[PDB]
Design a protein around this motif. Structure first.
Motif, PDB file in Angstrom:
ATOM      1  N   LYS B 200       0.805  -1.213   0.000  1.00  0.00           N
ATOM      2  CA  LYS B 200       0.000   0.000   0.000  1.00  0.00           C
ATOM      3  C   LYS B 200       0.843   1.271   0.000  1.00  0.00           C
ATOM      4  O   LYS B 200       0.339   2.332  -0.393  1.00  0.00           O
ATOM      5  CB  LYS B 200      -0.965   0.027   1.192  1.00  0.00           C
ATOM      6  N   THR B 201       2.096   1.181   0.449  1.00  0.00           N
ATOM      7  CA  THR B 201       3.029   2.329   0.314  1.00  0.00           C
ATOM      8  C   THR B 201       3.349   2.569  -1.141  1.00  0.00           C
ATOM      9  O   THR B 201       3.238   3.708  -1.624  1.00  0.00           O
ATOM     10  CB  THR B 201       4.338   2.103   1.097  1.00  0.00           C
ATOM     11  N   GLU B 203       1.606   1.530  -3.785  1.00  0.00           N
ATOM     12  CA  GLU B 203       0.392   1.945  -4.493  1.00  0.00           C
ATOM     13  C   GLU B 203      -0.004   3.403  -4.184  1.00  0.00           C
ATOM     14  O   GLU B 203      -0.428   4.143  -5.087  1.00  0.00           O
ATOM     15  CB  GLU B 203      -0.766   0.983  -4.208  1.00  0.00           C
ATOM     16  N   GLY B 204       0.137   3.819  -2.925  1.00  0.00           N
ATOM     17  CA  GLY B 204      -0.177   5.180  -2.560  1.00  0.00           C
ATOM     18  C   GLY B 204       0.739   6.195  -3.211  1.00  0.00           C
ATOM     19  O   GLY B 204       0.268   7.263  -3.643  1.00  0.00           O
ATOM     20  N   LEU B 205       2.028   5.861  -3.273  1.00  0.00           N
ATOM     21  CA  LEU B 205       2.985   6.720  -3.986  1.00  0.00           C
ATOM     22  C   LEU B 205       2.637   6.841  -5.457  1.00  0.00           C
ATOM     23  O   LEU B 205       2.690   7.941  -6.061  1.00  0.00           O
ATOM     24  CB  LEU B 205       4.372   6.112  -3.875  1.00  0.00           C
ATOM     25  N   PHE B 208      -0.383   9.156  -5.784  1.00  0.00           N
ATOM     26  CA  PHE B 208       0.006  10.562  -5.554  1.00  0.00           C
ATOM     27  C   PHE B 208       0.722  11.135  -6.761  1.00  0.00           C
ATOM     28  O   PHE B 208       0.488  12.301  -7.129  1.00  0.00           O
ATOM     29  CB  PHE B 208       0.931  10.723  -4.336  1.00  0.00           C
TER      30      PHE B 208
END
Ligand code: F6R
Ligand code: F6R
Ligand code: F6R
Ligand code: F6R
Ligand code: F6R
Ligand code: F6R
Ligand code: F6R
Ligand code: F6R
Lengths: 223, 223, 223, 223, 223, 223, 223, 223
Positions: B200-201, B203-205, B208
């Motif tokens: 999820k880190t 994917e979140g990056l 963004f």
């Protein structure tokens, strides 16, 4: 527990600030890019939030490399003493947090999804760590359990990094964060707005008004 | 919680130290024998690790007898102020630890498999004790339970010996060690690397970045 | 609890089956690609495993679409009555499972990472569901907790789908699975081998032998 | 819960049998070789125990290989219908248990030190499994916890193998085994002897005798 | 937690003291009477232990009456500043303890079998109280339960009397005493020697040595 | 646990039904009013859902008075054997439920916010009761607590009314409902679609496919 | 924990004081009236107990009205500086306690049966509060429960009033009071005497004597 | 714990004050309007209560807007140093609390029904926060659980706002508040009077009287 507002919407921010219950603001690239449309510029939005909000305002770097992160971080910090530099949980991000912490620039490590990521951010010296509870809920894990483990870990080692519960989606994330003892929660505006309310408050006030009219038809209190 | 790297591989050590997330190194005679191949000498490897790591570096004696152990210990200590002498949990080993502690030489008692062995090492004055959680898992006991008991015992007696969780095989050994409150974990490099990561880190990056491109084609943060 | 071997290595399979402690086999496209080297064909390997194992053998479809999945499934099933079709937790995969269950073809839903995915697979009619405990450990969640929740959920609804604990990395995954009550574990061969062993078993045998020699030089039991 | 006597001492056995509280006997090569001295032959000791004891009598094979184990097992079984063949937890031992169970020869798997060993013995069809609690105590692990896990595991899968708690060293192993619900305990003679006794039983009887003398000087009860 | 040796055997005491792990010694009249044979006199035995052990040595009075107890206590104390006078939990014994404590003579109340007896001893001023866990186990009560209650009671009232766990029979009495937080355990020699040992320690040592010979043929560590 | 879709959007319903994971549908006047715009009439919407969904479809009465409720209920029931009449928790509503249950018309009591309301609905004969967890979360009470109490109450009295968890806002409401053992959850479409998904599923699938191409260039499984 | 004797019998008091284990005495009007027969006068009994006991002696007023209670309290106090005035939990009693506390006369509120009565007594400034455990047992409530609640409440508010457990009937009231952490227990003589005793203490002493005779037919310890 | 009386009835207040157990008074518009009848004026009632009660007296504002609330609060404050201004949990009310706190005017936030409302009141600087337990009981939630959560929250953040439990209906709300550790309870008169009472207190007094008459016919205590 501090309560921050998680938005880049300037109207929402002005409203929450006037309520007196907003202790700071968090933003991220998605939140800002949502507002920076139809002519509005992201730099202006960021500057306006820094101006309006007395407390901490988190603004995320966009660079993925150490040097760019540190350069952007220094610009952000230069925008105002209340700016806090949001940096993702990556190798370069930890390096950047270490460097910035040595430069007395406040930092917030974001995109944290488990307690050992949060511990690594703390070991790099980060001012706040932001575990994402709602995104964990999204994938079928109760995100609040990660908050509970982080609190225990930080208590074990007297860690000074503040736990900033992020990706908050409802008032029970807020309640559970307070019962656990998280330092900060950051909340979307809808959620923030509901925290003050309860139907029994509304009903009780209505009955007090009605009952008072019996002894003061104009409804006032003359003392 | 301190995080040591459990390896004698110089490249691993350089890289982890470079990430800034490594607080020391543990070796043992197997790890070193693994590196001392093709003309590489164990002495050079030990001296190099002492040189490039700022934190504690554990190096194990090979003698099984009291006098050999203290002689080798004093040599290891003489190699640098960050050297810590690793000494096995045996009768000769406890005597060696007591002597060396009297001489202000830092020590790490290794090959510990239950809580009373750890208590005996602490009573000898040892600086670190290293229970082997993975090797207990191997024989069908949950090794983390031994770490919990040692943490309770050491808390009961205000013991100053640091609990150094060793034989770590996965990131849950690390997580449970941090929740229990162990002082140190020592981890292989692959484990170390996995601790910074989460899907999820990533994917979140990615998200963004994609969202930021909408309002900044060059993908930069110009402030 | 059934114990399956998680490998496509024929020698491992032969040996484990020979020990008499192996109740079936799971494969996946990675395990097989590992064996299909130097002229060895995947089809031969799959057919051979079906041939030599008496219990269930799981073989994964490679198509990502409903129709390809059911076509490959029917072929796999056609290979022998012990073949079980492994199908991923996806939208197309759930539809495939429902169809195949209607056709009395046994199925195993794989790549499951939380309890509600497992419940959905069970609701599709799947014969086995395979949560991946080691891959959850890898991302900093204790994977065994997911097995406990699935066991409770399936007990609540008298679900007949078997819980097949997969991505097993150590003998404590196995121990915790048995205490929870999972229906099956699938284990790599090295793990399987370690489950029979204990140092006190070896030491006790050695001592019984030494003591028996005292009264029987030839070390035999003549009755 | 059945209570067996763990000895090859024929006098101890005769005494416990006359007490009426001994439901069977376990032996091992060390126990037998201890008695088989100064002319006494092991085959005679074994035959005498089988003759004296009405219930199950466990006798351990000494061969380490499958074929020898099965040959010795058949001789043991041929000595009497109450003989039970003790076989160690090894690869060959599991193979032998499987074969013997198919031949309706009762078996007892010994030298078990963790719950997954016990589960493997059960899966081979063993009549009794003997986890060793005192030897685990010897190495600093509370052996009764293994009994508790075995009971849970066996309850989970409705396993018919009986849990025979062995290596018993004191009456609290016995108490805890009964509270857990182990099927059998096997106890050394000293321990067995203490189970019937309590100082308040002795004191109460003495006071009853004294008080009764007041109304019946000869101490009898004439009805 | 201090570890005393519970014996009057000079050879065992010399051995344990030379191991460096023995912090003191407890004796009782049975223990001394066992050694005072074939010419050896109890007075020499007592004096010899006092000379060999730098830490506390507990020696029991034999008088049952206050005056005799107090006189014997003063003699015992006269033998050396490390002598501690062991006095049974009786009405006379409590009076003796109160008098001796006023005289600054260190005392150990023995033959304690429940927590309220231990509290009465503490209230008389006793330096150590010795609850007898093995003798409770003998009569079918888990003796460690009593230690846990005494720890809680002493913590509630900030009692300075040390809890000295006696009648220890196995290494789990010692483990549980440490987890509870008893001040002292006194252990027979067989138990003491077993505390340092574990099969994985021996196995690990053997493997390290084997691996080291690969890089250093003489098995040496030259630095 | 059955999974219903909580919506009146025909496209969402068609999509979920075609996924094969939707067991029924709940609607309410707000949900229907949202769809009944730009010419679409509520009657057509209701009939269309009844035609598309083979399972229960819950449709709420709008009358607040008993007679009107009962009349509307009979019309709703007249639309199809899968129609379930949703009736609010009010005095009139309970009377209506009792009458309708006698008529063998299936009923769903809605707007329930505590466990005693749920018990009153069950006692009136209702087929389903729908406690509203999200709206409790909104006012700062963890709504799932109420589901757990209702499950326990219904289990105590062997109540046949189904617990239908409503006002579901996230996948943890669903997870917790399954662990508690609620009979049914009704979920909005966004939540439903998220239940099948997990990042490790996607990542694992991608790796399997990559590995398979190594042995089968076309990505096919030919058997 | 202080241990008081709950009696007006001068012989019991003298015996207990002489044992050295009695820290104070409580009386009440029933206990005194019991002794003041056959020409013995209550004034004499009260004065004699005050004279014999070094510690606190509680003597209860007989007036039910405020003015009489305060007068009687002043007379009791005038009898000796160790007198404590026992006052019942009634409205006038609470007034009397507040007044006497302002006059530095120590007080003990008696006839307390729940924790909020105890709290009210503390709020009045009482020196001791006496909840009655045995009279609660008499009416089918476990009286120790209120002791536990009172301890928690007093800890919460750092209350200086001592908890004096009264109406004690057996040694387990004493045990449980000490484990809870009550400040004082007051016990009848029969119970007091029983606290020092245990059959294994008697047995152990007898065996030590017997073994010592072997090395000293005198039965003496000459040093 | 402080105990306030929750009423505006002067007779009740006078009686409770005269009992000496009342630490303060809370009122609200309904309670005052109940008493301001038959020519009695609210201003006079308020002043009379402020005069009679030494401790805090909480008087509620009736304005719903910030300006008017602050104006009324200053009037209330002006009435007496013990006046505490009661302000409802509303946006305007939090604003007024912040202003008044900055002016060192004591405040009590009322109509609180969950723990996050209480936390918001504490963050505004309120002196007391009053969660309403009986009104929560009225809607089927155990209101005391809210007090327990508030106590934990306030303990986590070292909050100085006092928890004033309000809407109390019975003595068990009082008991549970004390065990949780609330700072204040406010109770209606009939509850206050029942707190001092218990049937065994009455029965014990009667028996003491009867027994005392046996030795002092006039029922006097002459000392
Ligand atoms: C003020 C806040 O402490 C109090 O007077 C409260 O309004 C009452 O305690 C509320 O009680 P009711 O629910 O009985 O009105
Ligand atoms: C020294 C003690 O901290 C370490 O190097 C240990 O020897 C290893 O951690 C043991 O690990 P293995 O079980 O993998 O050898
Ligand atoms: C099939 C599902 O039971 C199994 O072969 C699984 O793919 C593996 O157990 C997954 O293990 P890894 O995480 O080691 O690939
Ligand atoms: C900064 C970290 O505190 C925040 O703006 C986070 O990015 C958001 O709280 C994450 O929320 P979503 O999961 O709703 O993006
Ligand atoms: C047979 C297995 O039930 C028994 O005779 C065991 O070998 C002994 O109980 C083991 O006891 P020790 O640890 O005392 O040898
Ligand atoms: C003195 C008290 O600490 C000790 O010597 C005790 O007498 C023994 O520990 C008692 O042990 P046994 O029950 O084994 O006699
Ligand atoms: C019927 C009762 O099962 C449902 O349609 C409910 O009205 C909704 O689930 C309520 O959800 P909201 O709180 O989101 O309206
Ligand atoms: C004074 C208060 O501590 C005591 O004398 C009590 O009255 C007694 O302890 C009451 O005991 P009984 O219930 O047995 O009368």
């Amino acid at each position: 527990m501090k309560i921050f507002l998680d938005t880049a919407n300037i109207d929402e921010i002005r409203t929450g600030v006037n309520w007196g219950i907003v202790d700071g603001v968090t933003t991220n690239p998605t939140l800002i890019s949502k507002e920076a449309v139809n002519g509005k510029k992201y730099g202006d939005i960021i500057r306006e939030i820094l101006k309006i909000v007395d407390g901490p305002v988190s603004v995320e770097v966009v660079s993925t490399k150490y040097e760019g992160m540190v350069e952007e971080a220094r610009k952000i910090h230069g925008l105002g003493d209340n700016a806090v530099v949001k940096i993702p949980m990556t190798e370069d991000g930890l390096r950047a947090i270490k460097t910035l912490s040595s430069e007395h620039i406040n930092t917030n490590c974001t995109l944290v999804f488990n307690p050992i990521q949060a511990l690594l951010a703390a070991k790099a010296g980060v001012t706040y760590v932001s575990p994402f509870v709602g995104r964990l809920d999204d994938i079928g894990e109760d995100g609040m359990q990660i908050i509970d483990m982080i609190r225990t870990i930080f208590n074990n080692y007297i860690i000074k990094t503040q736990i900033l519960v992020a990706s908050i989606r409802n008032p029970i994330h807020v309640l559970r964060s307070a019962v656990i003892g998280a330092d900060v929660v950051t909340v979307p505006f809808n959620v923030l707005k509901s925290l003050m309310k309860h139907p029994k408050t509304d009903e009780g006030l209505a009955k007090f008004l009605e009952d008072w009219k019996k002894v003061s038809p104009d409804g006032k209190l003359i003392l």
